[PDB]
Amino acid sequence: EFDAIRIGLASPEMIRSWSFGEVKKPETINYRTFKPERDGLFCAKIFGPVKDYECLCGKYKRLKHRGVICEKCGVEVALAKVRRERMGHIELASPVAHIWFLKSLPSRIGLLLDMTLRDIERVLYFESYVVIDPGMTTLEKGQLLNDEQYFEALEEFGDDFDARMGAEAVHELLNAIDLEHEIGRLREEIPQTNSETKIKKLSKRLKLMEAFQGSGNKPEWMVLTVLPVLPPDLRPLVPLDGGRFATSDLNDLYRRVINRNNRLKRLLDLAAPDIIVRNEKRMLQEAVDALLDNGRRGRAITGSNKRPLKSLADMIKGKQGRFRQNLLGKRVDYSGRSVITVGPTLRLHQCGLPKKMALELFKPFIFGKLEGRGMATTIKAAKKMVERELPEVWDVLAEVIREHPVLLNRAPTLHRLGIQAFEPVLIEGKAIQLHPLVCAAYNADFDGDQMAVHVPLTLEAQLEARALMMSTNNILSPANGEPIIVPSQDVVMGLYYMTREAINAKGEGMAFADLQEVDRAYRSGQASLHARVKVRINEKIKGEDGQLTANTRIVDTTVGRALLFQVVPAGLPFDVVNQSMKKKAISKLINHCYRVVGLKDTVIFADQLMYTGFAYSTISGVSIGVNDFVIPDEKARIINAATDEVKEIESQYASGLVTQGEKYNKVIDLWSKANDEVSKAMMANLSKEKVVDREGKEVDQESFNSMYMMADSGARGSAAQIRQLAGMRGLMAKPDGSIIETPITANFREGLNVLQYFISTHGARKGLADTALKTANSGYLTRRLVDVAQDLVVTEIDCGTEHGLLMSPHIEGGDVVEPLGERVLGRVIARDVFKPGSDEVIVPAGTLIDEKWVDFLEVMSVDEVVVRSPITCETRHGICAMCYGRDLARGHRVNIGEAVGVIAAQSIGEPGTQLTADNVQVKNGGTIRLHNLKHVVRADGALVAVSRSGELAVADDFGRERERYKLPYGAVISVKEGDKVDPGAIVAKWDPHTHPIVTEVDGTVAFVGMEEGITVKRQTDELTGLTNIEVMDPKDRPAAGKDIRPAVKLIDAAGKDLLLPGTDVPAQYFLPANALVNLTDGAKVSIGDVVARIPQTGGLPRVADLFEARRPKEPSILAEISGTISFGKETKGKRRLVITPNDGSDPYEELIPKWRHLNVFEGEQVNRGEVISDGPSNPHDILRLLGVSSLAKYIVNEIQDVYRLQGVKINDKHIETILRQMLRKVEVSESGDSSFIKGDQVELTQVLEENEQLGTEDKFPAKYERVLLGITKASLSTESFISAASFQETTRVLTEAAVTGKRDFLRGLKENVVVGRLIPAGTGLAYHSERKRQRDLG
Amino acid sequence: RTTDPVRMYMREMGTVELLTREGEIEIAKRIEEGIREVMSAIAQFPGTVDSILADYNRIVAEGGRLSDVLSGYIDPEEARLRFTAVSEQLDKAKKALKQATAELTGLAELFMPIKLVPKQFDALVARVRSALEGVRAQERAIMQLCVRDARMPRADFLRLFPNHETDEKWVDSVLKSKPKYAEAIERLRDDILRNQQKLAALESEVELTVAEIKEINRAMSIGEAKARRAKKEMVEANLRLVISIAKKYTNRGLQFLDLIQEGNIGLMKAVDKFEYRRGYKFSTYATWWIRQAITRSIADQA
Amino acid sequence: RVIVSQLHRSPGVFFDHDRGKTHSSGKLLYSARIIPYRGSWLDFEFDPKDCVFVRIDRRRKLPASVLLRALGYSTEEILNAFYA
Amino acid sequence: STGSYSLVTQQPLGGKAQFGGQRFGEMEVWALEAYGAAYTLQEMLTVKSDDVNGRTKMYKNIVDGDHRMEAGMPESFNVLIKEIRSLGIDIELET
DNA sequence: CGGGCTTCGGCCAGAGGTCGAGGGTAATAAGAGAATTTATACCTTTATCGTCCCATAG
RNA sequence: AUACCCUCGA
DNA sequence: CTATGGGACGATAAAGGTATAAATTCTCTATAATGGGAGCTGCTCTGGCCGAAGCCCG
Ligand SMILES: [Mg+2]
């Protein structure tokens, strides 16, 4: 065994140790005799023998001496496999710099010499000298000299100045670094300079120097004086048929390097002139650079082809970018594929398998069984029987297939559900038969899809297939507890048609003694499928745990509902099946049955539902005909009216009265209203388009029109599509996004004109083009999500912490978006839950909330609860099994070893393909309550609230808040806390239209410095619209009026100076430009009076932005520290708003440029959490100021809005898991034990602080600040280098690991995947634990 | 910050300019002057002259060919007369080994116009540099011995010892200087003296002293440096020709720089085998060698 | 085998003024581009600070005055011919 | 079921024409990881492909009717090791 | 009034779904002739190892 | 039995 | 009277000589010839990285 794969620089001595010879000849194989030549790229002396256990001459052919090397044949006789491990070396006449440590964005060789990459490139390209060992001379070691400059320096000095050129000079510089002295000097000079940029550069210098010192790495090794050569089979020449040979790019590059090296030696040995020698050295540097990588500087090309050569960097990068196609993809055996086909006679656990595919896949199993039964003696006979397809081979094939599950997956597997185990059944054909109910999970229709089939071999593999990924096990979606193996289109249609009702039908009225009599009457044809009848039933209810009570009851229902209830298992009431059985109702029924009865009865119920749905959709000859699309009669009248209106509006525009810009909006609004009215009329006609006779007088009933059934049942189609099918198509958008001024009046039944078809083509082309980019972005996003959240696996059971996130129902707006029940279902409680009256414990502790608990919480008036979240659970290297709540694919709590991180990433990324103001008006009646409001009462009781943080809530009678609204600054509210307000009332009468400035104090104000023409302007509007004064702009004012700002000095009614609480200075708010101060100076202004009034995306890109924690073009400016805010000096061009908190004055405040509008009013509480200027928030400021839980709530809500817009439901556990993975790193402020500023894992800092507490001193513990990293940045910054190297930027991370000397302990999922070990999660957890037991404990 | 290597090759080479054919004649005259100087230096080494007499004896005994020994002057019968004269000069110089110095100067004058095949040139160079290597090795041996054992100071080392290396005068003088280091030297008298006996044997083989051999080898080195400088000037002149001719074979399955470097090697070979008395332009002869080099390079890569 | 007809940008001159985030400002009347049937492509960019820069297909941005002078226009004749 | 593999990386080739097998790419490997199924994943990326001494031994086990699945180490990781070494950066193990 | 110091603008790197499936295309010209090394081929000389006669120890 | 290009399906 | 060590024996394989044809690399030819050319232009964003230009500032 082994562990902890290391990475470091290759020493010339260790490079020699690796090699088995010195490659010296460029050519590979002689054209006359086809054996590799001496000292060539395939020489037998170096790389090994061509034929296993053979030599060059054949002197020794026996298989006995496997290590002896013959006398005439120096090529040691050994196995042919050895050509894969044996490498050689090339001795270069001069050293050449390594391309990776040169051209990486932070140049390691440049950083180690404190000289810019440009200067090093000048030296390497033989353009300028560099100075080595300055000695006692004016020249410095870092000084570069030109030809004339160097000649002058040599003439002036003569000696004591070693100046060189090329990579030889760089090598001479590197080995004279004296890393100890440089580290000491740079550490001494690190705190001397207070510049942030310089301190950052010297900190990076320190990091590199300490990495080199600790890692046992030598700086001179960066410039390789000797380079290896790949073993011949890893750079093979695959002979083309016809005697041609196909040479790999590696062979071409190696040949080029060898040729240039041989040229170098034989031109230095004859003392060629300096210019040509330096040109040859440059060529050798370029050739080695092209061998190592390409396109960085030179972009070398091949012969007679514009395609660049493939270097080793591109080889290790793999295909598909950096996603290793050989170490992660790894085409497998015992596999096949074919087109899929629906099999309606299949049970949920089994799938059809063609005879030939099954016979080919299970061939070794068939051979084994044939030999065991003795029917075949030699394997040749077994092959003859299996190829003859003798009748007895089908019996043994059936025996090997009986209990051997197989794996089926679609091409894009967006989640674990995309590959499930099926117990194959032999079928006659070439297509793979699929169960209809698993198509939804696979997202696989039968329009040409193909599926790959894989045969697990080991008993471990078969048991994992049967116990974890058998199709019956995964009924519920891992993304949300809602079922995924649910009736789809056709079976939903059948079940819906069965459970309908007709006003008058054959067989209506009589009573049936049992469901059996109902079936007997229906099959005999004496009763309609949907006829209102009476039937008594024997339902067994599971109301009490462990006690199944059966009761007999007579229910008024239909024949179809009674028939379908005969399928329902024995734990559910009949009332669950007495409705119309729409798709959502059926899905909820399956979900309820799973959580009540079990799993086996649930799969039986699902199979029975599918069978009956198919049977009764076949019995009902439902069909689509031209008469089914019922065009409403009023559509013609509505269209004519709208055409008359648009003609009138066009005439008005021609008159010039109406502007084109307003006419566009008017006509689009008119046409949208007409389209909505037409659609409403069509739906109202279609839905009730049934007139029936009930023993005389005619009556109406729900329609039996086929298209209406297909919509209402939810089987297939939507109202938006019937809007096109039977109503006007409505407005359509031009490619620029502007809605075309004329709509499509015709529907698909009437047929569109040519122009309308062309517009619909605009729309359809836009959508179809968007689809492919949506798929690509979703794939990239889910790949990044998986690679950032893979190491997270449940390890502990209960971490022990009591921190979590306060979860409350999402009530953004007037309606409840998500009830509290759905948010905390399957979660775990973090603290006590209390009644409306305290001291009464409802939910004690971390009890996993289930259906019973959510019903209990709904019965009580619990509104806000705190639950344990993965962002909590401070356990190290994993997550506790509580803080990650109930598993979603299973009904119970998660089990140790569940890779919830990968499940989270798959859950978030799977539905990506589905992606792309004055006053408050209370909705319903409820007791109004205030939250986070800080305002004093007005003179008359207006209660104007100037605080920016504040909201208005209308709590229900029970106590839960039914609706909440954001109350803005300066809002007058008729405070009636505890007094119920009727629905539609306007309790708060805010009307900002401006930035009002409240006046918390009263008295006769003293507007000091109000200059009419310099600071203010008594400009009155027309018709005496305002008796006020307009403040003069700072630049529009005079030279002296530019610096003068109006100030309303705080005085009382008699002239007494007043000041705001907390600060001695008065609340004399300045009046800036564009102000509205109506109150006369010296007039008593009431408390809260308005003094100064100043007038003021979505889809996959948005969720990607949130998961990368990006900064938009204009981020929202937020307050830094809570306290007394000030005014920003606009003269300097950037507003500086100093903050003076009452608890402690901190004068530090940044300057915000006035390029973006700032809506901040001075003289109020800063409220660090609050916002200073509008705009989309920058995830960071929220994290570093509001906290972690606040950032968690904001990010979760932001992602969930995007997902809920398309109606896809995803549990928040997954988003919180990804958030935990991103917040995994923290930066340190005052270390005492580490570097000043460093990005270290929070686990590392926590461990260091815990050890320091019980250690040398007590102050050794470090203080740190949490930092947020994007997924593409958090994934590349992992401690393991193998995980990052196979994600992205392989070169950068590999060079960083090389210089840093990183070690990778294979303790993640991808590490064990690439190295071929058992996964540290799932069933490999036991193996990993035993390995840890045997390793750590001796 | 151009990254194109061809571009910087053009920049660095573009400083030098061409020259008319009289300039080529002058450069070839410089080459001839250097080789004449080094050959005249070789004349002051009796072993080399005896070796050229032996090669002539092989010529007469048909052990060597006319084209494998001589390369003209500034038919074998003129060679007969010239080597008879040089042998008579050698014998008259050896007879009176004062006036012997004048006799060797006349010997160098007579052997000065002669020109020989490069193989014999490298043989003569190998002999003289081997004598130099022996002297230098004795220097290093004595130096490491005394410095690392007796701690005898480097100042008196580089003051009194040099240029004799053969007589007991320096050992005795250091012994009479009476430091403790001279007392420690007495343990190392035997090895140093027997190595100096070998040096004296080498000198008696060559009949010359250390200072004389140093003078001749220094003059030969100066002549070689002059010839090397002339060749450098000439090849830097013809770099333009080599790039111009290298244009023909770009897409021949080989890089441009490899082609021009092989053509450069060919043109240095051409310079090594170019004479001005042919009365021809250089380009005519350089084209053949450059074509040979480039074509062979491309043929090797098939 | 069949040669599928290709549709490509027509040779001539093209003017672009699409709103872009490169300037991080309101708007910038973008470059004027010349495309030949065969030969080098000339672009007439427009700097954010109300300046015109010209770059050949395979070069960096250079001030339009350099090209104007190289064409033979005087440093004062061009100003009078264009600005007034 | 079994057949000739690629000469550089000992993995089955692709496409009916070269026999060949379907590839458990990154997404399907993630899907197996989301399941607790690690033994089938390890056997899938170890025994069915990329292991010389594993394939033959697993064939033996299947023929005799026992399913032991001695793991071994994939050959593609060895290829990666030699390529990284040829890039002049050392790789080893801590044993 | 030079100088840290923040900020901004130009420039380069890297990354962009998966799994199929099929088809096609993949890369040239000095002769002479001299010389040096190398694989070959025959032959003799010495040691080696298979081989058996012979005296003797029990 | 290696790389590009083209076309096609989900 | 028999099994075993001891010594004689001899047929041959390796070692060295020793030329010898293959073969495979090396060296020459003398009007003159004295800075190459394909290189794309229709991503898109993000992110980092230097380098320059305002911006406080004492
Ligand atoms: Mg489909």
Numbering used by the authors:
A (entry chain D): 16 to 931, 947 to 1126, 1135 to 1376
B (entry chain F): 95 to 168, 217 to 239, 247 to 451
C (entry chain C): 147 to 230
D (entry chain C): 1262 to 1356
Text of the article:
AlpA positively regulates a programmed cell death pathway linked to the virulence of Pseudomonas aeruginosa by recognizing an AlpA binding element within the promoter, then binding RNA polymerase directly and allowing it to bypass an intrinsic terminator positioned downstream. AlpA then positively regulates the cell lysis genes alpBCDE by functioning as a processive antiterminator. In particular, AlpA recognizes a putative AlpA binding element (ABE) located between the −10 and −35 elements of the alpB promoter (PalpB), binds RNAP directly, and allows it to bypass an intrinsic termination site (tB) positioned downstream of PalpB. Like 21Q, AlpA forms a narrow ring inside the RNA exit channel and renders RNAP resistant to termination signals by prohibiting RNA hairpin formation.
To obtain the structure of an AlpA-loading complex, we used a nucleic-acid scaffold corresponding to positions −31 to + 31 of promoter PalpB. The scaffold contains an ABE, a consensus −10-like sequence, a 13-bp transcription bubble maintained in the unwound state by having non-complementary sequences on nontemplate and template strands, and a 12-nt RNA. 3D classification revealed the structure of the AlpA-loading complex, determined at a nominal resolution of 3.3 Å. Unlike 21Q, only one AlpA molecule binds to the ABE and RNA exit channel in the loading complex. In addition, σR2 binds to the −10-like sequence in the same way as in 21Q-loading complex and RNAP-promoter open complex, in accordance with the observation that the −10-like sequence is critical for AlpA-dependent transcription antitermination. σ70 conserved regions σR3, σR3.2 and σR4 are displaced from RNAP, probably due to the steric clashes between σR3.2, σR4, and the 5′ end of nascent RNA, consistent with the fact that σR3, σR3.2 and σR4 are dispensable for σ-dependent pause. The N-terminal segment of AlpA, including L1, L2 and H2 forms a ring-like structure, while the C-terminal segment of AlpA, including H7 and H8, forms a helix-turn-helix motif. In the AlpA-loading complex structure, the helix-turn-helix motif formed by H7 and H8 participates in the recognition of ABE. Specifically, residues R128, K138, S139, T140 and H142 are positioned in the major groove, potentially making interactions with DNA that could enable sequence readout. Our structure of the AlpA-loading complex reveals that the N-terminal segment of AlpA forms a ring-like structure and contacts various elements of the RNA exit channel. In particular, H3 sits on the exterior opening of the RNA exit channel and interacts with the dock, while H2 inserts into the RNA exit channel and interacts with the zipper, lid, and zinc binding domain (ZBD).
